Amino acid sequence: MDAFEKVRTKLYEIINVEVKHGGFVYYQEGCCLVRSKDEEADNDNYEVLFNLEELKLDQPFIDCIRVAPDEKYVAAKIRTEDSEASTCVIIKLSDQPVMEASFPNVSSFEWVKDEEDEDVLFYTFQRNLRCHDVYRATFGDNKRNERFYTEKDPSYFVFLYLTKDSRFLTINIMNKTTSEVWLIDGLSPWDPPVLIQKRIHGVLYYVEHRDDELYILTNVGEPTEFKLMRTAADTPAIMNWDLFFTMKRNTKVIDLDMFKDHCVLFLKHSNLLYVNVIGLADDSVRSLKLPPWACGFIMDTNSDPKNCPFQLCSPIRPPKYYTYKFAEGKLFEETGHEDPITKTSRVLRLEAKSKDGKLVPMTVFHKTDSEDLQKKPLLVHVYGAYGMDLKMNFRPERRVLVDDGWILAYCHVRGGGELGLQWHADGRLTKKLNGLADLEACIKTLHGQGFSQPSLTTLTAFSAGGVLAGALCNSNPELVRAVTLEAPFLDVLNTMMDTTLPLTLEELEEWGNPSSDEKHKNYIKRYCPYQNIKPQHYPSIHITAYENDERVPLKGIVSYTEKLKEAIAEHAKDTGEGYQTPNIILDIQPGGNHVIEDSHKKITAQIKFLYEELGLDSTSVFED
């Protein structure tokens, strides 16, 4: 399971942390862990549990909260900004909440309802970035900790997960391609763990339990195909797994909600998304009727044993709440609370014809009442690397564009994982030219199909997406008028061969090692924007660069801006007489973005830059 909801959550702007357990809602209200009633009376009525200063950290916030079944203790992950370490703090919930422990560097942790009626904490951390340990901490008779597992492979992550029925605690040793799951008896955690199946290189599997039967999500036999399997808890060996549900090729399992008698499975195939309820005992398999305007889920990894809440969203419509009303027959729209985004939107799944003849899916969607004769500005998105899908979350800075007539395009080029591993195998450093072979063809297919013209075509990118952005500026700059870049990545070769002190763990497997390979010099020099900067006419650029960033060198892009200005000046000096030099802006912003306001006002700086290079008046009336 590649981008699974439990995997990606343990794999821009801050997110809230709000765990509801036992009639109380745990969160921080001013760097101070509190607990309020199930439905808050006032925004000020809450019980103070732990103040975050008592750790002497800089800008600490809650990462996740896990509550003991007895509620006698609460574990919280304290993680700060502009740092790398964290701390899992444990507070005793008595008539005077006090801290009794604080373990650092803890990745994941879960509580275990113990047969001896004692809250048992399981947690995991790395010893000198070398390998993971799993301990057991109790706080009643002060049994201290107990290492009972030690994964010895540094290349393997280790995360804990509790089955919804709390029957088993899964110790999940994981790799990008290989996994291995152990089981802790939820009815006696002190028993040694049980290995389900020794890892098999290439075989991923994730284990959920229901009623004495282990339901196992795996791609055994074929990595491109995922599938659900069952086995008895007494016989969990791989030779005892029977197929139970078959998924299409290259589907993306993005969540699995196990229930007392069925199993809900949230999937994504191509750009289409599906959810279907699978009967455990019976053969019930019904695929729910999804609305066409939806382009992505918003999952909440907390659910009751008889209802399946989920949430649909697109880059234009705010998230809409849903639930498989289990005992009934699935409700949807909460009350009548709905936005008329659908009244005029045009969510269109389209395909592009790349130069090497492969269908490239791209999602375009705009107002339908917009008269057809005129053409409105087009803003396309791209990433096409790391196997990541292009994010379809709701962005308020995009609704205001479509409301003003804009045309939005989401180009899911190769390098991403929309069409599976096959899509990600292509568009990597050895074949990144395919990423351009799709991004260029996507824009051309839009123009050929009469959507917008290069005078009104723009694009935005982000970090790794800036590679295909700057390359297109040196490949075919006649297709774009303006470009906005957010912490972009331009001189890939002058960052990698210049191996002063870059960690570069996964970047080698994505962008090949150029400092010790000839083939990893020729091909990377073909598309690296810094190496194909030729003095020509360019689109306008607005870079909202962050000074404090380790994935993006400030030198690597500040040097790109000046070299870009020297290149256009040489092209200017050649034909400097009405050439109209493009405006190139670099808005250096210090530190990671602290509040929602600064990022949402750099939004305004990006939108105003686009409306300047096109001159489309100004419609910036909106909330935040």
- In DSSP notation, 509-571 reads HHS---TT-SHHHHTHHHH-TTTS--SS---EEEE--BSS-SSS-HHHHHHHHHHHHHHHHHH
Reduce the DSSP state of residue 599 to 3 states and report it.
helix
Domain extent listing, the chain = 5-325, 347-614
Superfamily per CATH, domain 5-325: Prolyl oligopeptidase, N-terminal domain (2.130.10.120)
Q: 466 is written with which tokens? A: 């800036």
Q: Please, which residues have CB within 8 angstroms of residue 40's CB and are 6 or more apart in sequence?
A: 25, 46
Assess whether 549 carries a catalytic annotation. Answer: yes
Reduce the DSSP state of residue 294 to 3 states and report it.
coil
Distance in angstroms (rounded) separating the CA atoms of residues 194 and 205: 15
Distance in angstroms (rounded) separating the CA atoms of residues 428 and 524: 10
Distance in angstroms (rounded) separating the CA atoms of residues 287 and 264: 10
Q: Please, which residues have CB within 8 angstroms of residue 488's CB and are 6 or more apart in sequence?
A: 461, 462, 463, 465, 466, 469, 470, 543, 545, 552, 557, 560
Domain spanning 347-614, CATH class = alpha beta
Beta-strand runs (E) in 403-520:
407-411, 457-462, 482-486
Distance in angstroms (rounded) separating the CA atoms of residues 396 and 499: 39
The single residue of 117, 188, 211, 594 carrying the catalytic annotation is 594
The single residue of 269, 403, 549, 559 carrying the catalytic annotation is 549
Nearest CA among 502, 505, 507 for reference residue 549: 502
Assess whether 618 carries a catalytic annotation. Answer: no
Distance in angstroms (rounded) separating the CA atoms of residues 461 and 470: 9
Cβ atoms within 10 A of the Cβ of 308, count? 23
With vertex at residue 18, the alpha carbon angle to CA 12 and CA 24, rounded to the nearest 5 degrees, is 170
Contact 458, 472 (CB under 8 A): no
Q: Render 381-394 in DSSP notation, one character per residue.
A: EE---TTPPPP---
Distance in angstroms (rounded) separating the CA atoms of residues 159 and 173: 7
With vertex at residue 293, the alpha carbon angle to CA 290 and CA 297, rounded to the nearest 5 degrees, is 65
The structure was resolved experimentally with X-ray
Contact 520, 526 (CB under 8 A): no
Q: What's the Cα-to-Cα distance from 611 to each of 301, 316, 367, 408, 561, rounded to whole Å?
A: 40, 19, 19, 15, 22
Distance in angstroms (rounded) separating the CA atoms of residues 186 and 353: 53
Q: What's the Cα-to-Cα distance from 355 to each of 110, 352, 358, 448, rounded to whole Å?
A: 50, 10, 8, 15
The single residue of 102, 166, 370, 463 carrying the catalytic annotation is 463
Q: At what angle do helices 596-614 and 396-403 cross, to 10 degrees?
A: 30
Q: 526 is written with which tokens? A: 């073909």
Contact 440, 475 (CB under 8 A): yes
Beta-strand runs (E) in 166-318:
168-174, 179-185, 194-195, 205-209, 213-218, 225-232, 242-249, 252-258, 262-269, 272-279, 285-287, 296-297, 307-313
- Evaluate the CA torsion angle 31, 124, 154, 383 in order and state its sign: negative
Nearest CA among 366, 360, 345 for reference residue 271: 360
Q: Please, which residues have CB within 8 angstroms of residue 298's CB and are 6 or more apart in sequence?
A: 310, 311, 312, 313, 319, 393
With vertex at residue 179, the alpha carbon angle to CA 218 and CA 390, rounded to the nearest 5 degrees, is 70
Which DSSP symbol is given to 495?
Answer: H
Q: 516 is written with which tokens? A: 């010790």
Distance in angstroms (rounded) separating the CA atoms of residues 179 and 105: 22
